[PDB]
Design a protein around this ligand. Sequence first.
Ligand SMILES: *[C@@H]1O[C@H](CO)[C@@H](O[C@@H]2O[C@H](CO)[C@@H](O[C@@H]3O[C@H](CO)[C@@H](O)[C@H](O[C@H]4O[C@H](CO)[C@@H](O)[C@H](O)[C@@H]4O)[C@@H]3O[C@@H]3OC[C@@H](O)[C@H](O)[C@H]3O)[C@H](O)[C@H]2NC(C)=O)[C@H](O[C@@H]2O[C@@H](C)[C@@H](O)[C@@H](O)[C@@H]2O)[C@H]1NC(C)=O
Ligand SMILES: *[C@@H]1O[C@H](CO)[C@@H](O[C@@H]2O[C@H](CO)[C@@H](O[C@@H]3O[C@H](CO)[C@@H](O)[C@H](O[C@H]4O[C@H](CO)[C@@H](O)[C@H](O)[C@@H]4O)[C@@H]3O[C@@H]3OC[C@@H](O)[C@H](O)[C@H]3O)[C@H](O)[C@H]2NC(C)=O)[C@H](O[C@@H]2O[C@@H](C)[C@@H](O)[C@@H](O)[C@@H]2O)[C@H]1NC(C)=O
Ligand SMILES: *[C@@H]1O[C@H](CO)[C@@H](O[C@@H]2O[C@H](CO)[C@@H](O[C@@H]3O[C@H](CO)[C@@H](O)[C@H](O)[C@@H]3O[C@@H]3OC[C@@H](O)[C@H](O)[C@H]3O)[C@H](O)[C@H]2NC(C)=O)[C@H](O[C@@H]2O[C@@H](C)[C@@H](O)[C@@H](O)[C@@H]2O)[C@H]1NC(C)=O
Ligand SMILES: *[C@@H]1O[C@H](CO)[C@@H](O[C@@H]2O[C@H](CO)[C@@H](O[C@@H]3O[C@H](CO)[C@@H](O)[C@H](O)[C@@H]3O[C@@H]3OC[C@@H](O)[C@H](O)[C@H]3O)[C@H](O)[C@H]2NC(C)=O)[C@H](O[C@@H]2O[C@@H](C)[C@@H](O)[C@@H](O)[C@@H]2O)[C@H]1NC(C)=O
Ligand SMILES: *[C@@H]1O[C@H](CO)[C@@H](O[C@@H]2O[C@H](CO)[C@H](O)[C@H](O)[C@H]2NC(C)=O)[C@H](O)[C@H]1NC(C)=O
Ligand SMILES: *[C@@H]1O[C@H](CO)[C@@H](O[C@@H]2O[C@H](CO)[C@H](O)[C@H](O)[C@H]2NC(C)=O)[C@H](O)[C@H]1NC(C)=O
Ligand SMILES: *[C@@H]1O[C@H](CO)[C@@H](O)[C@H](O)[C@H]1NC(C)=O
Ligand SMILES: *[C@@H]1O[C@H](CO)[C@@H](O)[C@H](O)[C@H]1NC(C)=O
Ligand SMILES: *[C@@H]1O[C@H](CO)[C@@H](O)[C@H](O)[C@H]1NC(C)=O
Ligand SMILES: *[C@@H]1O[C@H](CO)[C@@H](O)[C@H](O)[C@H]1NC(C)=O
Ligand SMILES: *[C@@H]1O[C@H](CO)[C@@H](O)[C@H](O)[C@H]1NC(C)=O
Ligand SMILES: *[C@@H]1O[C@H](CO)[C@@H](O)[C@H](O)[C@H]1NC(C)=O
Ligand SMILES: *[C@@H]1O[C@H](CO)[C@@H](O)[C@H](O)[C@H]1NC(C)=O
Ligand SMILES: *[C@@H]1O[C@H](CO)[C@@H](O)[C@H](O)[C@H]1NC(C)=O
Ligand SMILES: *[C@@H]1O[C@H](CO)[C@@H](O)[C@H](O)[C@H]1NC(C)=O
Ligand SMILES: *[C@@H]1O[C@H](CO)[C@@H](O)[C@H](O)[C@H]1NC(C)=O
Ligand SMILES: *[C@@H]1O[C@H](CO)[C@@H](O)[C@H](O)[C@H]1NC(C)=O
Ligand SMILES: *[C@@H]1O[C@H](CO)[C@@H](O)[C@H](O)[C@H]1NC(C)=O
Ligand SMILES: O=C1O[C@H](CO)[C@@H](O)[C@H](O)[C@H]1O
Ligand SMILES: O=C1O[C@H](CO)[C@@H](O)[C@H](O)[C@H]1O
Ligand SMILES: [Zn+2]
Lengths: 499, 499
Amino acid sequence: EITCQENLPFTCGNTDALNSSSFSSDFIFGVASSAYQIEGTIGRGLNIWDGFTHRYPNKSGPDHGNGDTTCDSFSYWQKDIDVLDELNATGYRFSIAWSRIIPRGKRSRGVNEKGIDYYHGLISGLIKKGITPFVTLFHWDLPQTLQDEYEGFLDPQIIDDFKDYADLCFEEFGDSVKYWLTINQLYSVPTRGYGSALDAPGRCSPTVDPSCYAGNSSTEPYIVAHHQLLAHAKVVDLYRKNYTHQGGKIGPTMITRWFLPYNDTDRHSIAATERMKEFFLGWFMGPLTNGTYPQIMIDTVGERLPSFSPEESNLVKGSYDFLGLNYYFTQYAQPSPNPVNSTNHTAMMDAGAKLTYINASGHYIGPLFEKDKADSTDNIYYYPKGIYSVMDYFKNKYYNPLIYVTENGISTPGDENRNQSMLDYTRIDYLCSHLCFLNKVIKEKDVNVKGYLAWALGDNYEFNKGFTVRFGLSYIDWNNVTDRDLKKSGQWYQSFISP
Amino acid sequence: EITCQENLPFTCGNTDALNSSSFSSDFIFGVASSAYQIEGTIGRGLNIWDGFTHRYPNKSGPDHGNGDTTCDSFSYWQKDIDVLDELNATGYRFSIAWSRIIPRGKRSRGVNEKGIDYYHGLISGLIKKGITPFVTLFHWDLPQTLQDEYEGFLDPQIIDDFKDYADLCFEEFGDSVKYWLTINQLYSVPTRGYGSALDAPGRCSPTVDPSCYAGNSSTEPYIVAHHQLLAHAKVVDLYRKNYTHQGGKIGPTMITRWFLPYNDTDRHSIAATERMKEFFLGWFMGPLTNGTYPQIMIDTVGERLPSFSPEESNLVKGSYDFLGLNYYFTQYAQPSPNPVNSTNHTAMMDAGAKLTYINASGHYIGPLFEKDKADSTDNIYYYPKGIYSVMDYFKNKYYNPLIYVTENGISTPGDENRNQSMLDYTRIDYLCSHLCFLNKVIKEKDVNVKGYLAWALGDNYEFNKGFTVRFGLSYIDWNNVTDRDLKKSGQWYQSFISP
Ligand SMILES: *[C@@H]1O[C@H](CO)[C@@H](O[C@@H]2O[C@H](CO)[C@@H](O[C@@H]3O[C@H](CO)[C@@H](O)[C@H](O[C@H]4O[C@H](CO)[C@@H](O)[C@H](O)[C@@H]4O)[C@@H]3O[C@@H]3OC[C@@H](O)[C@H](O)[C@H]3O)[C@H](O)[C@H]2NC(C)=O)[C@H](O[C@@H]2O[C@@H](C)[C@@H](O)[C@@H](O)[C@@H]2O)[C@H]1NC(C)=O
Ligand SMILES: *[C@@H]1O[C@H](CO)[C@@H](O[C@@H]2O[C@H](CO)[C@@H](O[C@@H]3O[C@H](CO)[C@@H](O)[C@H](O[C@H]4O[C@H](CO)[C@@H](O)[C@H](O)[C@@H]4O)[C@@H]3O[C@@H]3OC[C@@H](O)[C@H](O)[C@H]3O)[C@H](O)[C@H]2NC(C)=O)[C@H](O[C@@H]2O[C@@H](C)[C@@H](O)[C@@H](O)[C@@H]2O)[C@H]1NC(C)=O
Ligand SMILES: *[C@@H]1O[C@H](CO)[C@@H](O[C@@H]2O[C@H](CO)[C@@H](O[C@@H]3O[C@H](CO)[C@@H](O)[C@H](O)[C@@H]3O[C@@H]3OC[C@@H](O)[C@H](O)[C@H]3O)[C@H](O)[C@H]2NC(C)=O)[C@H](O[C@@H]2O[C@@H](C)[C@@H](O)[C@@H](O)[C@@H]2O)[C@H]1NC(C)=O
Ligand SMILES: *[C@@H]1O[C@H](CO)[C@@H](O[C@@H]2O[C@H](CO)[C@@H](O[C@@H]3O[C@H](CO)[C@@H](O)[C@H](O)[C@@H]3O[C@@H]3OC[C@@H](O)[C@H](O)[C@H]3O)[C@H](O)[C@H]2NC(C)=O)[C@H](O[C@@H]2O[C@@H](C)[C@@H](O)[C@@H](O)[C@@H]2O)[C@H]1NC(C)=O
Ligand SMILES: *[C@@H]1O[C@H](CO)[C@@H](O[C@@H]2O[C@H](CO)[C@H](O)[C@H](O)[C@H]2NC(C)=O)[C@H](O)[C@H]1NC(C)=O
Ligand SMILES: *[C@@H]1O[C@H](CO)[C@@H](O[C@@H]2O[C@H](CO)[C@H](O)[C@H](O)[C@H]2NC(C)=O)[C@H](O)[C@H]1NC(C)=O
Ligand SMILES: *[C@@H]1O[C@H](CO)[C@@H](O)[C@H](O)[C@H]1NC(C)=O
Ligand SMILES: *[C@@H]1O[C@H](CO)[C@@H](O)[C@H](O)[C@H]1NC(C)=O
Ligand SMILES: *[C@@H]1O[C@H](CO)[C@@H](O)[C@H](O)[C@H]1NC(C)=O
Ligand SMILES: *[C@@H]1O[C@H](CO)[C@@H](O)[C@H](O)[C@H]1NC(C)=O
Ligand SMILES: *[C@@H]1O[C@H](CO)[C@@H](O)[C@H](O)[C@H]1NC(C)=O
Ligand SMILES: *[C@@H]1O[C@H](CO)[C@@H](O)[C@H](O)[C@H]1NC(C)=O
Ligand SMILES: *[C@@H]1O[C@H](CO)[C@@H](O)[C@H](O)[C@H]1NC(C)=O
Ligand SMILES: *[C@@H]1O[C@H](CO)[C@@H](O)[C@H](O)[C@H]1NC(C)=O
Ligand SMILES: *[C@@H]1O[C@H](CO)[C@@H](O)[C@H](O)[C@H]1NC(C)=O
Ligand SMILES: *[C@@H]1O[C@H](CO)[C@@H](O)[C@H](O)[C@H]1NC(C)=O
Ligand SMILES: *[C@@H]1O[C@H](CO)[C@@H](O)[C@H](O)[C@H]1NC(C)=O
Ligand SMILES: *[C@@H]1O[C@H](CO)[C@@H](O)[C@H](O)[C@H]1NC(C)=O
Ligand SMILES: O=C1O[C@H](CO)[C@@H](O)[C@H](O)[C@H]1O
Ligand SMILES: O=C1O[C@H](CO)[C@@H](O)[C@H](O)[C@H]1O
Ligand SMILES: [Zn+2]
């Protein structure tokens, strides 16, 4: 019988008690990254994260930091491989920058053969060290041209452009890459890119944020989510019909959270909690397992929710060989009004729920996950058991999928000095506490989880935060980015992997 | 009788001997700038100088500097006005960033009303201080979307997109702006952007520079020049047919140089010198005054030189109310082979001339203009009399045009410290020596020159050089860009203006 801790202090950092041998022998362990965050703009065209961070600098991070140079994994990809080799990692999740291989967005406009060669060299170097690539086709960095031509995922033109890009990636890399991810965290671009305008492209309703260049927070998140599902499904169809000879697998990436009632004896809170599961997970998992949105969304969102045609429904239903599930934290849910006629209405208000990290009797859900210096009441707290609850729910509700945990990790402040940043015991605690629960859910519930990829290989540009936080298991000095030095977390993960 | 110096030392910095009263009372004196160089990316979409400087960082400057933040004239436009007010300047030449008012390039895709308001506030603040705006519609910063859609000025689609952009600028600002410039220095984008790939967009033949993403240095400069002439002419037609009620004037900007024979008793050198005038100036002045390219270009360039249809010829011929002439230096010309079959052939080799600053008997043409630390044999030298020769030639060869000198200036090293940078006596010498010759040519040859705009108002991002050189008459500290402090040159120019 496995026991896992939920509260500080944790003791799971002792590899005598928890290590890779705790898991099945074929389980994959590694880390993850994304192209905008690590490569730099050298050698590629511009994308909407270049556009957004330059047009709206105060939304790029408090330091106005961006991915222009970052850790220069364009130049130093071999040092990333060296980190992985040092870890004895068996998987690496990275993303291809669409603007690096098709700068002009539409494939017929030409390919960047030097960009293709960059990924070929990376992929070959990973395989040569025994590392299995998990490659994300689209980690948010859409070519700027496509956003300016037709507003990217707001328009159905995105489907064919995304299909032709994927085709190119399968053609060029699929003989070596056997695990593909389509779109990073389905929920994020519709809500943050088109709803609150915290993320690129930065669209919203005028009274939500006067700085947005255009948008409608109440309708656009649904149109964009719809198109993401259709673009994903068209790419999976292409992969499974035209690249079956490669013997690989493909799936979407979901952002997962667990949700608990703010007040677990109040029926209103309990109902808000179940609504959250449907609005947050079901928005995409409904269509991916059934070809339809959840009925509560159909009922609430009404005319704002697009419909799938019978053909589209069939294309989207079952459009995965696995699910890449990112997991970071859990929230409590309580009821909140949905003012659909307010000029500041957003799609996120349609779930009729307010989300917190503290419940009605004052309990904070778990240890500190992210301190918010402008407002401490907005600090984020984590909950190790949420990864068990999420995996169990996916097995039970969503037809026992094959799952890879594609991201899991925690930041530490960018204000810390190098010595403090290297002594990242809070990261060891976060990672081990989640891995204990992950092993427990695989053993107790038989969830088909086959790998884990911690976020992040090394320090990088963090969406929305610049360089003001660090998520790496290896440290990077912003005054000289060549080296990636394992932190205490990296050193612990090395021992967990090869105990 | 006016005497002007050609060699150091100069004595024209004494305002008792040369000042604004030397010139006609209505003559305009000011300074110039350009949007990419001064504004920053805040509040605008991305353009090909963002694209090029980010994709090819070593071509942005030796320091990899770019226009991301620069002197932040988005925030500090009022400080620019304050510099001009301090100078008692009567003209300011600045450019509109197409990506600030039409981020998506094509007008039908929407306008950025906040961008329009930025220029309205600038324009109103200039007029309120008695400063006449001279506004450049296109100072190289093409929206990236247009370059990715159809390769910008490589395609004839540019004509209508440029026309619709100009229309917007005339509609919004023309009630206050009475001097418009279409395209900055016609010669530069075709040769440097599509020939040597030193400038955005960075196209060339593969063996000219392996880093170019695509191109053909032998044909593309001619196609791009052609389209520039057609786009310019369509915009002038639009202005003169639909905005005559505004009572303004419009013209192109030419980069001018004078050319002298490397050996002035050698017929081959003399012929190379006359070829240079035709290839450098005539390439555009031929079509602008006659609707046809020069016959030597027709003969040499053959099938690579596009033809104007009778309609196009008529549109381009006479398509100016004035000429904005930039002038910085002069070169000696000697013969050079034109290897049209070489894979590294460029359009610039078609003139059959090699250009130097030293003649056959070892004479350097004038004082140092730009030191080249990698190769001193590549130092640039200036020649004050060249501005007299250029203005005289334009009056004689090109039908006595109205002319405004739209740029004239000199850099000083970015390695100098603040005190050294403020003591910019070399700049006073450069500016006064050229102004002496300009007054002399207006008096002796009756050239219709009506204003002078020194380059630059303040230190900025310099195309190709980053922040490694400074051209301002006012200093900007890169660690805190708010202030613009008049240098000795600025202080001298103030006294020259109001002696
Ligand atoms: C898995 O996919 C199944 C479809 O392949 C889902 O079953 C379908 O569920 C829908 C309701 O969502 C049932 O459709 C209703 O059919 C009646 C009977 O003819 C309707 O009037 C009703 O339409 C009205 O309600 C709609 C909101 O639901 C409004 O949009 C519409 O304007 C009407 O006001 C609806 O009819 C649909 O109306 C909209 C049309 O565009 C659409 O094509 C039309 O079908 C439908 O009969 C049912 N199909 C089958 C084959 O059973 C299934 O839904 C789950 O199960 C069903 C039994 C219900 O309990 C659902 O509430 C529940 O979601 C879904 N499974 C999951 C878990 O989502
Ligand atoms: C100002 O614009 C005037 C036109 O409005 C120029 O005059 C025209 O000059 C052209 C030559 O450039 C004369 O055209 C020739 O006409 C004969 C007689 O019919 C031709 O065969 C000759 O064509 C051959 O040579 C061409 C290279 O010039 C090749 O491209 C072509 O394949 C032939 O091999 C040329 O005919 C032209 O051929 C190309 C067709 O596309 C074109 O439409 C056709 O006209 C032309 O007659 C003349 N027009 C008039 C009305 O005079 C004028 O040129 C200047 O003056 C003329 C007298 C010549 O001295 C030119 O050399 C000199 O440039 C130009 N002015 C300036 C200063 O450029
Ligand atoms: C968890 O949710 C539960 C269920 O909602 C909360 O318990 C309820 O709390 C209500 C107070 O918010 C109780 O109602 C009140 O009852 C007193 C005593 O009779 C009465 O004077 C009130 O005015 C009020 O009555 C309601 O008034 C509004 C009417 O529309 C409604 O019909 C009335 O019921 C309610 O009795 C109680 N329900 C139960 C099943 O216990 C619970 O609140 C916490 O515990 C209760 C016992 C009470 O001590 C609250 O102060 C305390 O906050 C909430 N838990 C937390 C931690 O917030
Ligand atoms: C400015 O250009 C002029 C005109 O080209 C240069 O003058 C010419 O310089 C040539 C040498 O480069 C002279 O030709 C030579 O004459 C000597 C004496 O007879 C003879 O031994 C040579 O081998 C050579 O002759 C040529 O050989 C090649 C044949 O194809 C051709 O037909 C022959 O002429 C030439 O006479 C001279 N022309 C004139 C009109 O003076 C001038 O060069 C400078 O001055 C000349 C006088 C001489 O001292 C050169 O050394 C000196 O560089 C050049 N000026 C500069 C500063 O480069
Ligand atoms: C978001 O886009 C929705 C739908 O286009 C707008 O909501 C609509 O408002 C128009 C004008 O009132 C209609 O009258 C509809 O009744 C209503 N439609 C639905 C489906 O709600 C909404 O106003 C607009 N939001 C903003 C901020 O532009
Ligand atoms: C530049 O583009 C020109 C014209 O398309 C190419 O020059 C041509 O080369 C093709 C193949 O040899 C032809 O055979 C032509 O005779 C010749 N045309 C002319 C007008 O010169 C040139 O090869 C190409 N340059 C590069 C570097 O791609
Ligand atoms: C690994 O952890 C297991 C418990 O899951 C423990 O029994 C085993 O001894 C540990 N392996 C090493 C080498 O410490
Ligand atoms: C941040 O930038 C936007 C312009 O992009 C502006 O609306 C807003 O005032 C700025 N925010 C703060 C808090 O200064
Ligand atoms: C499969 O590839 C073939 C050949 O290029 C093409 O005809 C077919 O449309 C492709 N697509 C899908 C998604 O099946
Ligand atoms: C608009 O929404 C903000 C946040 O969503 C909220 O604080 C405010 O009360 C709302 N105002 C109106 C008029 O509904
Ligand atoms: C920066 O880091 C690399 C790797 O440690 C080192 O070899 C190089 O000398 C350093 N560069 C400077 C300028 O300090
Ligand atoms: C790498 O992991 C394999 C598999 O568990 C193990 O046998 C090998 O010794 C490890 N290598 C190192 C250097 O830790
Ligand atoms: C200006 O220069 C002229 C010579 O061009 C001179 O005669 C006049 O006195 C000077 N004005 C002043 C105020 O020094
Ligand atoms: C500069 O960058 C280009 C890639 O954009 C590369 O071809 C070249 O080697 C670099 N130049 C130097 C001198 O290092
Ligand atoms: C003039 O503006 C009118 C009205 O918009 C339009 O019909 C005409 O095509 C325009 N163009 C030019 C360049 O004359
Ligand atoms: C190619 O041109 C470079 C510069 O234009 C020159 O140095 C070289 O000799 C040329 N090579 C050939 C093969 O023509
Ligand atoms: C920078 O310059 C402005 C203008 O001189 C000054 O007022 C401000 O205090 C300075 N900022 C810092 C941080 O030094
Ligand atoms: C500004 O220039 C005008 C025109 O020459 C002159 O009359 C006025 O005194 C000057 N102002 C200053 C402060 O120099
Ligand atoms: O889920 C995410 O979380 C990471 C941590 O916030 C972020 O850096 C990745 O790009 C993103 O996919
Ligand atoms: O001619 C120019 O010279 C200036 C000096 O090189 C440059 O900064 C301007 O942008 C350009 O128009
Ligand atoms: Zn940048």
